[PDB]
UniProtKB/Swiss-Prot annotation, chains B, C:
Other noteworthy facts: Present with 259 molecules/cell in log phase SD medium.
Domain of life of the native organism: Eukaryota
The record's account of how the chain is modified after translation: Autophosphorylated mainly on serine residues; phosphorylation enables nucleotide binding by the active site.
Protein name per the record: Serine/threonine-protein kinase/endoribonuclease IRE1
Reported impact of Y161A: Decreases activation of the unfolded protein response
Organism of this sequence: Saccharomyces cerevisiae (strain ATCC 204508 / S288c) (Baker's yeast)
Length: 8, 301, 301
C-alpha cells in the first residue's frame, strides 16, 4: 500500500 | 499486540455520541452495524449549575479527552478556562477562602470495563464500580469524573463528565496509530454524522447516516491474527473558534476546532456571535431565547 | 499562607489512627484533647481477598501515602510488590489476559473535605461525595481509593484504602516543614502511642496515652496571625524490615521502617520470622494460628 500523507 | 504494525485493521469502527450511546459503524461505507442506548451507560456530560437565567452565565465543557472547561457569560461571550475536568478532580480536595467568598472542590473519578459482542452489540459483561457480570468481542474502558464545587454563598455547581477509552494496556499502540493504516480517515461531521475522506487529498468518500447525537469519540479496531483478539485503538486525527450546543438533559457543551476542526468548519456562526440584537439582556432571561442565541460557533479571543 | 516561616506553630497536633479515627493531641505533653470515632468516617484499609486458609497468602497494604502493596505467602514469607494502590487505581481499567488466566482492574478514587472545630472535635460541615453539610476550626481533606480486581477463574479481590491529607492548596508549605519548627519531633510508637523526642539528641520527652488504634497519620497545625486561620501541614519525619498487624475488620497491614522506623524498631520479631516450628502448614489452616504466626516484624529481602 503506498498510501501517501498530507504535506508537512 | 506489541507493534501495531502487525495486526489487521478491522472493518469495524466504534463511535461514541454525546449522549453516551455506542455504535459500531462499518468503516467502508459508514453503515451503522448496531447501536446501544445510553440508559445502558451514563450521560457523557451532565453540568448542574446555580442558574443561567438570573445570572447570564453558563458552565460548559468540551466532552473530550481530559474534558476541557469553557464558560459563557452574556457580558463577555465565551471564554476558555485554563482548567480541565480531570485536572480539577486531580487536585481535590481544594478549599479556597478568597480575600470575599470561599469554595470547596471535592472530586471523584471511577473506572469501568465492558466487554461487548462486536457482531451484535450485546454487552456480555460489565466490570467495575458499575455492575460486575460474567469469540469476536471487544473490551472497552470508560473513565467517569465528577467534580462537585461547594460555594458557601450558595452558588453551587455539580458537573459529572464521563469518557470512553482503550484498555490502558494498549495505549502505547495509540502512539503508533499516527495516521489511518487504511487510506481512509473519518471524523465527526454536520448533523450528527461521520464523514470519511481520503488521506492524500482530503476528499469526501462516504457520509454516515444520523446518530442520536453528535459523535465525539472514535475508535479503530485491530485484529491480532495470532491470538485472534479484538484490540481497539483511537482513530488518529488529521493535521480558535468553538462550537456550542446542548445535550438532551440541557447541559451545554463545546467542541473546539482543535478537536473537531471538520465539524466546526461545517457549522453556522452562532447568532450571539453575529448580531447584538442577540446580546441584549431580555434574551438571557428566557431559556429558549438564550439557547438560540449562543448555539453555534463562537470565537474565543 | 505563602511562607511557612511566618505562622505560629499551634500547640494542637492532629493524629489519625489506623482504624480511621481522628484525634487532636496536645503537642506539649501528648494529652488527648479529643477523639472522633471512625463511624464518622471510613475504615482506612479494608482488604477483601479470596481466602487465606485455602491458599496460604494474604494481601497487605501499608496505610500510608500512596498506600503501598505488600504480600505474604507461607511459602516465601513477606514480599514487597513494586506497586502502590494510588498507582494501581491510576492505571485502570486494565484488562490483562496472561498466556493461563485473565484479570481486569477497575478503580475508583474519591475526594472529601471536613471542617471540624478544633477546640472541641465536632464536625461542623462535611463536603464531597460524602455528605454535604453547612472561628477556631480547621479544614482537613481525605482521599479514598478503591481498587477492585476481577479474575475470571474467580480469585476475586477488593481492597479499599483511604488516607487523610491537607488541603491541596497548602501542600507547598509541607516542603518547607522540613523539620519541626519546634524543638520537638513526635512519632508513632509502641502500643498505639505517640512518642515525642528532642531534635538535637533524639531523647524521649513525652509519651502519649493509648489510641484506639496504631497512629499512622500526623499533622502540625500552624496559625496565620494576620488572617487568623488554622492551616494544617504534615509533621516532618527524622533521618528493610516491615511490621505486620491487622485491623479490627481483620485486614492485614504493613508499616515499613522507612515510614515508621521508630515503631518498627520498638516492635517484637514476628514468630514466623523466628522459628520454623511456626512456618509449618498446619499453622495456616487456622485463622488464629496464622494471625499469631505472622503478626510482628518480618524482614523483606
Amino acid at each position: 500500500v503506498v498510501v501517501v500523507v498530507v504535506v508537512v | 499486540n506489541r507493534s501495531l504494525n502487525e495486526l489487521s485493521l478491522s472493518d469495524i469502527l466504534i463511535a461514541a455520541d454525546v449522549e453516551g450511546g455506542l455504535h459500531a459503524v462499518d468503516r467502508r461505507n459508514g453503515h451503522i452495524i448496531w447501536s446501544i442506548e445510553p440508559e445502558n451507560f451514563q450521560p457523557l456530560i451532565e453540568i448542574q449549575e446555580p442558574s443561567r437565567l438570573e445570572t447570564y452565565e453558563t458552565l460548559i465543557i468540551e466532552p473530550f479527552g481530559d474534558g476541557n472547561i469553557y464558560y459563557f457569560n452574556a457580558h463577555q461571550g465565551l471564554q476558555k478556562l485554563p482548567l480541565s475536568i480531570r485536572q480539577l478532580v486531580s487536585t481535590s480536595p481544594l478549599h479556597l477562602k478568597t480575600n470575599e467568598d470561599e469554595k470547596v472542590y471535592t472530586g471523584s473519578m471511577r473506572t469501568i470495563m465492558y466487554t461487548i459482542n462486536m457482531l451484535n452489540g450485546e454487552i456480555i459483561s460489565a466490570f467495575g464500580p458499575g455492575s460486575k457480570n460474567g469469540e469476536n468481542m471487544i473490551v472497552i474502558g470508560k473513565t467517569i469524573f465528577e467534580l462537585g464545587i461547594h460555594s458557601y454563598d450558595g452558588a453551587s455547581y455539580n458537573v459529572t463528565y464521563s469518557t470512553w477509552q482503550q484498555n490502558v494496556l494498549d495505549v502505547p499502540l495509540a502512539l503508533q496509530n499516527t495516521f489511518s493504516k487504511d487510506g481512509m480517515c473519518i471524523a465527526p461531521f454536520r448533523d450528527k454524522s461521520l464523514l470519511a475522506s481520503d488521506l492524500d487529498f482530503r476528499i469526501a468518500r462516504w457520509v454516515s447516516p444520523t446518530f442520536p447525537g453528535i459523535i465525539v469519540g472514535l475508535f479503530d479496531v485491530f485484529n491480532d491474527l495470532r491470538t485472534n483478539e479484538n484490540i481497539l485503538v483511537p482513530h488518529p486525527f488529521n493535521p480558535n473558534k468553538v462550537y456550542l450546543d446542548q445535550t438532551s438533559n440541557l447541559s451545554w457543551f463545546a467542541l473546539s476546532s482543535q478537536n473537531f476542526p471538520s465539524l466546526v468548519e461545517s457549522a453556522p456562526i452562532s447568532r450571539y456571535a453575529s448580531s447584538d440584537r442577540w446580546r441584549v439582556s431580555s434574551i438571557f432571561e428566557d431559556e429558549t431565547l438564550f439557547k438560540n442565541a449562543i448555539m453555534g460557533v463562537h470565537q474565543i479571543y
